[PDB]
Amino acid sequence: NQYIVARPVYSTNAFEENHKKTGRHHKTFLDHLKVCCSCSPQKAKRIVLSLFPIASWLPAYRLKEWLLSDIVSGISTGIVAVLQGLAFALLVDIPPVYGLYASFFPAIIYLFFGTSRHISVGPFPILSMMVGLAVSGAVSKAVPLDDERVRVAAAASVTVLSGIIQLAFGILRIGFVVIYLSESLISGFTTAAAVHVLVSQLKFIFQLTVPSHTDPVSIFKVLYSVFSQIEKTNIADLVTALIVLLVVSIVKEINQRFKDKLPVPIPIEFIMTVIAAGVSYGCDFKNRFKVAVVGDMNPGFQPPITPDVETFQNTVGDCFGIAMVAFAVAFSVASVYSLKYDYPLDGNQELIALGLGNIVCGVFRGFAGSTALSRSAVQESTGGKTQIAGLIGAIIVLIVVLAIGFLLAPLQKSVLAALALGNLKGMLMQFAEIGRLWRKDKYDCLIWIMTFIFTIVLGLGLGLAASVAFQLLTIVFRTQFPKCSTLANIGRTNIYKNKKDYYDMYEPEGVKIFRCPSPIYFANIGFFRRKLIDAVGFSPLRILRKRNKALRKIRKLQKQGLLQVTPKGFICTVDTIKDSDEELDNNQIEVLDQPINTTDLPFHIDWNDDLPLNIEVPKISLHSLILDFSAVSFLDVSSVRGLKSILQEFIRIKVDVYIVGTDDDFIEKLNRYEFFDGEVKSSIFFLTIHDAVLHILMKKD
Amino acid sequence: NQYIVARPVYSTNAFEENHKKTGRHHKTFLDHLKVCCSCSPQKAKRIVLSLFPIASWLPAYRLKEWLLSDIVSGISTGIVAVLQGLAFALLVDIPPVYGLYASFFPAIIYLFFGTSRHISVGPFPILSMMVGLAVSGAVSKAVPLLDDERVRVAAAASVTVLSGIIQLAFGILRIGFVVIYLSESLISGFTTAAAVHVLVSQLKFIFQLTVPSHTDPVSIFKVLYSVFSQIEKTNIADLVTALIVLLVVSIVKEINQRFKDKLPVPIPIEFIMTVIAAGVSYGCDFKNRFKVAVVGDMNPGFQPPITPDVETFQNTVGDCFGIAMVAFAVAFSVASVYSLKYDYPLDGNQELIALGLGNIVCGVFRGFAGSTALSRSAVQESTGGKTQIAGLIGAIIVLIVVLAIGFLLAPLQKSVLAALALGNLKGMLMQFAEIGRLWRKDKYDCLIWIMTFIFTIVLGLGLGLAASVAFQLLTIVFRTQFPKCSTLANIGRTNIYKNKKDYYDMYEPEGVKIFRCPSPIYFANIGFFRRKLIDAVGFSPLRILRKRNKALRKIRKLQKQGLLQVTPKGFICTVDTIKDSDEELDNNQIEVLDQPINTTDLPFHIDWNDDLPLNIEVPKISLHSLILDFSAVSFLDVSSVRGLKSILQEFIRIKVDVYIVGTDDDFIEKLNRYEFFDGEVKSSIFFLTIHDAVLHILMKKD
Numbered sequence A: 001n002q003y004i005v006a007r008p009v010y011s012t013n014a015f016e017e018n019h020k021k022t023g024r025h026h027k028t029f030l031d032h033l034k035v036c037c038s039c040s041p042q043k044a045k046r047i048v049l050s051l052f053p054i055a056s057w058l059p060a061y062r063l064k065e066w067l068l069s070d071i072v073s074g075i076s077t078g079i080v081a082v083l084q085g086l087a088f089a090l091l092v093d094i095p096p097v098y099g100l101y102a103s104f105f106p107a108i109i110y111l112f113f114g115t116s117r118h119i120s121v122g123p124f125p126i127l128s129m130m131v132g133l134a135v136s137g138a139v140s141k142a143v144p145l146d147d148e149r150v151r152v153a154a155a156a157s158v159t160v161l162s163g164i165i166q167l168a169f170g171i172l173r174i175g176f177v178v179i180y181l182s183e184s185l186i187s188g189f190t191t192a193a194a195v196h197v198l199v200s201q202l203k204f205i206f207q208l209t210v211p212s213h214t215d216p217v218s219i220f221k222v223l224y225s226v227f228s229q230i231e232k233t234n235i236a237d238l239v240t241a242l243i244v245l246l247v248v249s250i251v252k253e254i255n256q257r258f259k260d261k262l263p264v265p266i267p268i269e270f271i272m273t274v275i276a277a278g279v280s281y282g283c284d285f286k287n288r289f290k291v292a293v294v295g296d297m298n299p300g301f302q303p304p305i306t307p308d309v310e311t312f313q314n315t316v317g318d319c320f321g322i323a324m325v326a327f328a329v330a331f332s333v334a335s336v337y338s339l340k341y342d343y344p345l346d347g348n349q350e351l352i353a354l355g356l357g358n359i360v361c362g363v364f365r366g367f368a369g370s371t372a373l374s375r376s377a378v379q380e381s382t383g384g385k386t387q388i389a390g391l392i393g394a395i396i397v398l399i400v401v402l403a404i405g406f407l408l409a410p411l412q413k414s415v416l417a418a419l420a421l422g423n424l425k426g427m428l429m430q431f432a433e434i435g436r437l438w439r440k441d442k443y444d445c446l447i448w449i450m451t452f453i454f455t456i457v458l459g460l461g462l463g464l465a466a467s468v469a470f471q472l473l474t475i476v477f478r479t480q481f482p483k484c485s486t487l488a489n490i491g492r493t494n495i496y497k498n499k500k501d502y503y504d505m506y507e508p509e510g511v512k513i514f515r516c517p518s519p520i521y522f523a524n525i526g527f528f529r530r531k532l533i534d535a536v537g538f539s540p541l542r543i544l545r546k547r548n549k550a551l552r553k554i555r556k557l558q559k560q561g562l563l564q565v566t567p568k569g570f571i572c573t574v575d576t577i578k579d580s581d582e583e584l585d586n587n588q589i590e591v592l593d594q595p596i597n598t599t600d601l602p603f604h605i606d607w608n609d610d611l612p613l614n615i616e617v618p619k620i621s622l623h624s625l626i627l628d629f630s631a632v633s634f635l636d637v638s639s640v641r642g643l644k645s646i647l648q649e650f651i652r653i654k655v656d657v658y659i660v661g662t663d664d665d666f667i668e669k670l671n672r673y674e675f676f677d678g679e680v681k682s683s684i685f686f687l688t689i690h691d692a693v694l695h696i697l698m699k700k701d
Numbered sequence B: 001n002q003y004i005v006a007r008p009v010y011s012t013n014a015f016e017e018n019h020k021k022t023g024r025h026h027k028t029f030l031d032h033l034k035v036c037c038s039c040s041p042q043k044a045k046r047i048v049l050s051l052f053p054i055a056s057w058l059p060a061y062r063l064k065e066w067l068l069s070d071i072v073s074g075i076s077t078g079i080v081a082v083l084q085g086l087a088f089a090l091l092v093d094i095p096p097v098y099g100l101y102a103s104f105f106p107a108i109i110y111l112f113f114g115t116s117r118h119i120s121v122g123p124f125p126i127l128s129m130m131v132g133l134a135v136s137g138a139v140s141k142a143v144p145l146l147d148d149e150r151v152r153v154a155a156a157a158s159v160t161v162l163s164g165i166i167q168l169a170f171g172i173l174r175i176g177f178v179v180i181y182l183s184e185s186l187i188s189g190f191t192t193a194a195a196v197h198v199l200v201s202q203l204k205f206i207f208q209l210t211v212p213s214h215t216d217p218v219s220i221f222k223v224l225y226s227v228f229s230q231i232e233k234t235n236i237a238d239l240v241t242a243l244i245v246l247l248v249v250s251i252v253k254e255i256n257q258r259f260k261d262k263l264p265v266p267i268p269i270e271f272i273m274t275v276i277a278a279g280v281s282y283g284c285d286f287k288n289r290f291k292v293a294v295v296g297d298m299n300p301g302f303q304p305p306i307t308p309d310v311e312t313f314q315n316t317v318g319d320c321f322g323i324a325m326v327a328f329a330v331a332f333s334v335a336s337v338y339s340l341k342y343d344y345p346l347d348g349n350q351e352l353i354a355l356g357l358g359n360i361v362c363g364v365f366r367g368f369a370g371s372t373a374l375s376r377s378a379v380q381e382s383t384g385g386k387t388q389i390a391g392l393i394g395a396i397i398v399l400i401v402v403l404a405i406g407f408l409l410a411p412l413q414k415s416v417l418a419a420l421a422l423g424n425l426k427g428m429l430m431q432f433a434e435i436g437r438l439w440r441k442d443k444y445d446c447l448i449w450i451m452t453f454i455f456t457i458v459l460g461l462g463l464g465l466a467a468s469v470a471f472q473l474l475t476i477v478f479r480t481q482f483p484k485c486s487t488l489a490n491i492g493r494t495n496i497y498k499n500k501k502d503y504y505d506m507y508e509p510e511g512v513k514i515f516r517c518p519s520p521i522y523f524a525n526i527g528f529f530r531r532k533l534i535d536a537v538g539f540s541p542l543r544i545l546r547k548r549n550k551a552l553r554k555i556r557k558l559q560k561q562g563l564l565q566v567t568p569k570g571f572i573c574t575v576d577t578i579k580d581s582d583e584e585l586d587n588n589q590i591e592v593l594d595q596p597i598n599t600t601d602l603p604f605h606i607d608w609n610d611d612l613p614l615n616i617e618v619p620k621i622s623l624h625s626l627i628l629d630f631s632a633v634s635f636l637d638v639s640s641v642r643g644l645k646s647i648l649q650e651f652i653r654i655k656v657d658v659y660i661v662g663t664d665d666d667f668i669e670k671l672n673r674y675e676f677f678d679g680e681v682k683s684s685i686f687f688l689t690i691h692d693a694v695l696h697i698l699m700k701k702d
Ligand SMILES: CCCCCCCC/C=C\CCCCCCCC(=O)O[C@@H](COC(=O)CCCCCCCCCCCCCCC)COP(=O)([O-])OCC[N+](C)(C)C
Pocket: A174, A312, A313, A314, A316, A317, A320, A321, A324
């Protein structure tokens, strides 16, 4: 092997002048606007099909290979969705038939406007908790069965606003907001929310009466209310909830272990609820043990409702937090299946489909939902091929809402709470990410730990905003104090490494190579300046000021006649200089930062050589400063200004500055900042460190 | 002038093997915590000298060179500080003697604990506005005319004590570097919007109207309405006097800045205008003749110490934090200009400590928060300020005014004080020109400017700043969100690789792709990176693996059926035109298609880019080597390493070699901590440069 290269030394300007650069016209916003309004016939066809995805996938349905599958996954998931809807309507503190409404309308709208083929659309625990908190706040902030009616009305208006926000984000094509939530953040938020839900199910396991607490620290208020009244716990409910929680857990593991052997996952939720409903009815637990039951539900749908502006005004922030969490979750679950089954997934259409589904749901008295991973995993694991299975789940929910709902009358709320608690093992086990992130990346461990605390203390909605803000702040933490280094040549070749990391390294005399391994901007520009000064060994502005002082003294001593100018040196007729400094005042002291123009003097002054009449100036050995900008991705206004100041000061003390390792786009953007001028020129940019070093060597020889 | 190189090709590992690495110790947190508790004699002496800077700059005082200049500068800045304190006590909506207390106490404390030698310590308009808004909130949220102003004075003192406590705590924990979280354009937009706030807040004194104590959000509009809803009750004497003063001061301030050389000292115009205003207001009895609002009679002397209301503390925590952050940012900014202009070191943590102690003492003695005004620090410095003895002399004049000659400021109108404030406001108002400039240079900083302005005008000055800082952190993500990822090519049959779309006569080695992302890769852009890499190579590595696994499954089923035979020559098909019967894997078995293809059981290797027998079809790829130019990739977070590991494993399972080049030794060290390397992904994929990887590939292929 041999890396053999023989090319001329290239400055960025020289390379461009020797290589024809394809002239490429950048696409200005103006043009982008035109193609946007093309109105091509084909274009329109694409748009409409994109907004009504059912017109594409339905006509291509493989009946022989998907119908039976879709049917089975649909009946199974719908059976899960009925119970999940009842439980999550308990989480919202409204009658439970509204949970059935919530499990029927978004699935039906997403069947038409949705792009996922596997996600089960409906409520999930975190969003039901967020919606409940919003309604409790709205009822508190209102200028004046009734309580149930008021809560139900508020749950609908929050949902419509949440959906409108979702619909708006999808129309404006902002479907990329999901990138602003990292893996460590979502993890901490979701385990904190699982702890929230665990705490929220305690009033149903024990059957206690807990107020509608609101954030901050809502979880602790609930815990106090529960354990303060812990002695009133209904044992039958608890034993039941504990029995239901225990059994389902074991069966679920079996389903995850013997999955390959299992033809179909064992439906433990349906079986347990049926047995629970049966034994409660046969033994009349409601009277025998005073257990809390779901009760009788109205056999039908409710008439449409009008969104209340007052609720909208009092819950706008909560609805935003709700829309963002719903989109983050649904997209997240859908993405897993899209990468698993190789089909494209459009976020904008998702927001539109999730927005419209929520509007129809809030209009028809339901509450916000997107998807529950548990129910979706149940849909995908049971043979879900397309959104037809979802249509069958919504059909099962319909059947429950109109004809057989009366069977869910003797079912206890502790059983629903026990199921909702059983679905928490996946999110609760995410506490193991703390140690992993500690080992790998402590900024992401900080993101996780902080999100957990914020979510627990400030709540689901506010905890998330503070968490995203802190997540953005860690980016600054990572780049705030870059490990800048001085480089040196190792091997007498074109390899320049850290000077402190190897032996037998070589630094060309008078030359300094400095590397900042990060983008330079407002938060680290001062640090870059400090580290560059520590690396070169002096402050260029201080050297310039002392040189200007020395030149002022030379001019004062020579025009008085004590120092005669000669083209050979600084001969002095009298060597009786007395100690005296000018002591410039506040108004005049800035004359010491100006460039040294000694053209007035016949002979050049070697500032690094001894001066006449014992004038002392700090002598510098640096003549060439190379800045390795290879990992400097961007600059901002603050940093370009700091950079220019630094360079100007080094140039004014006659230190040639070279910037190497930058691409052509970097020099392109710097031109827009008006960085270059008479003093700082584009000839300071070279291709690599070695190019600059060879240029320096030939200049100096 | 030739770049001539003749060295061996180097993977990062071969370079570490050939060149012995200098062993360096671990900078452990425990041993660092060991140096923390030094208890050394000199260390104790330098710690105490730092916490008490006066013990180091006072003995080193140059009398014959500094004393008279400091005396003159102190006289001037104290005469300015009296009037500025009165005006800012107007801004806080308390009696005007508390502005004198705010101009006295922090200066005397900063004389002892301050590191700056040129800033004038005291209140400035933005902080007086913030303190007044915090005071209104405290009074509004307080659980149930002089008693109204007494409540406001107590709430101001308490807000000040809490602001000083927060500053002193931030200086004790050594967090004096938070000023870096405010960019030049954030500060520019904030100070322009705040100058607009201060302009609107002085209108109730120019016109002499009764405006309620509006609180944010949109207090500037609530206030604009209150003023113009009653613009018919405007006092004409107040407006005329305020106008004339503003005109004169503006002209002289210009005369001052321009003719700096001919004037030995700047013309004191604030002072002269105040004396003339008070004289023509007392002689002509403007108070009775035109019914103008005057400063009134002030209580001669200081007030006894007060105890901070914990209730006010509870109701103003957020406000006090904001008052503390804005105060530190302004003071540090003002002080920095002069540290740099005069070459002396400026400790930021001692700045926080001194400002916090000054605010605590001021609030205890019935003052309001203040850190420094750029206008008054300018007067002290331009009049010859050399040390903080000028601040001591300014505080002595404020003391003289408080105790002895405060009654002279009795007939002075408040419109004159408002006019002085506006004359000082023009400098910050002139920052609207930065909009167009930033638009041309950096639209992200233009966005920071405009959004900071809008957040500060619409929302409060405290919520506005918090919202503004958050959006400025978000623009950092905006920059590194959609990087201009590109494909490189060789240019000049040498070691120069540039954008494939930029020059003519470039050269792509057959089968090699070189991909460059010019940004750090993290959670917000790992998806965009994966998408652009897939667009660059021309295919999806995963789709290929699944199709090959699908094909291999069909090949294997056929073999189990005797329909074809496998021999060292290849696949022998006695039966051709096989029935097409796709397997249709289910949802729980489909994952088998992402597994590495293990065909070792088969006697011969399968050329997946050749023709497969019996109508089997797989996409063919020309790529056999992928170079990733990670030179400008600064950092990698956990999300990015996961996405990265994922992408690389897929390329490797489809037998495409992957190379990461251009990275430094710290970058690779960190990746080892992420558990990135393993049996499939090895540290051999790392090469020093692109040419090294390319040469290594040419050598492999040939
Ligand atoms: C491209 C990015 C898109 C951003 C879109 C942002 C949209 C922002 C636009 C509008 C929203 C903010 C103002 C409220 C709505 C305007 C109408 C209004 O008058 O406000 C009313 C309700 O307003 C409130 O009480 C809630 C205050 C805002 C909380 C939400 C902000 C954080 C969530 C957002 C997260 C942002 C990040 C989004 C990412 C998830 C109050 O005003 P009023 O009723 O006239 O008052 C009269 C007296 N009254 C009060 C008694 C009635």
